[PDB]
């Protein structure tokens, strides 16, 4: 009863037999399973259309592209570089991250500082 499910042509991500809120990777990439009444009267935990924009959720930062899926990896958005961790889609933020053996600094807002830190 756990995991990604499609019910009545709506997508949900279940834990404890209940739809969870968050950004989770179903069979169709990372989707935003949102609280009820976030967009177009979605119900609790339904995956919503959420496109070409950032999402701040519980002090983490995601970016959704043009298909309502959270991006991963290096991304250049509004003049800045971000790196969205492949296994969570959360932006690297708050200090030093080692990515493919190189160390970079990312601000609290997820923006990569110029240059290499180690």
């Amino acid at each position, epitope marked *: 009863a756990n995991g990604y499910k499609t019910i009545d042509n709506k997508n949900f991500y279940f834990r404890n037999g209940l739809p969870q809120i968050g950004v989770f990777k179903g069979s169709n990439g990372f989707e935003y399973f949102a609280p009820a009444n976030t967009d177009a009267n979605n119900i609790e935990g339904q995956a919503i259309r959420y496109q070409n924009r950032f999402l701040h959720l519980l002090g983490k930062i995601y970016y959704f592209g043009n298909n309502s899926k959270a991006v991963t990896g290096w*991304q250049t958005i509004n003049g800045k*570089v971000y790196y969205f961790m492949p296994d969570t889609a959360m932006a690297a933020a708050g200090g030093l991250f080692e990515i493919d053996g190189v160390i970079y600094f990312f601000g609290v807002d997820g923006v*990569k500082a*110029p240059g290499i830190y180690g």
Partner: nanobody
Framework: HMAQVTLKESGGGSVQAGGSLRLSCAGP????????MGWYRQVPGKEREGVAL????????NYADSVKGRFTISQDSAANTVYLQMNSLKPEDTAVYYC???????????????????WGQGTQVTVSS
């Protein structure tokens, strides 16, 4: 893979030798991966040459030797948009300047060589004696 992007250009113009002009080039707000943006120039009848590139969100610059110390490339601090400040213009700078976007190299540098992914439609700059 780097999808093609639209590059919208503005600026240019016509000046006497010694003048200054600015170009601007805007890309889409979101480009996956790393991106070098800037300009090449081509006089009708001649070959295209690199002018200046910058790696957006990091800042490596690459300039043609013929424009170093006269043209400066910068990025907008809130957009996937670059500017070329063309100071100390010479008649030999007269050309069509084309905005370009290309993937950043793995060491966070931009090269004029090995391919451009997307081009702007071009801006004429004319400098008279």
């Amino acid at each position: 893979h780097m999808a093609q992007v639209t590059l919208k250009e503005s600026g240019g113009g016509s000046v006497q030798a010694g003048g200054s002009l600015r170009l601007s080039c805007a890309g889409p707000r979101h480009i996956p991966g790393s991106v070098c943006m800037g300009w090449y120039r081509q006089v009708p009848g001649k070959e295209r040459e690199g002018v200046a590139l910058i790696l957006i969100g990091d800042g490596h610059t690459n300039y043609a030797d013929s424009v170093k110390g006269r043209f400066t490339i910068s990025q907008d601090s809130a957009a996937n948009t670059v500017y070329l400040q063309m100071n100390s213009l010479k008649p030999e700078d007269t050309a069509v300047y084309y905005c370009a976007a290309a993937r950043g190299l793995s060491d966070w540098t931009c090269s004029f060589e090995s391919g451009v992914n997307s081009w702007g439609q071009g801006t004429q700059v004319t400098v008279s004696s």
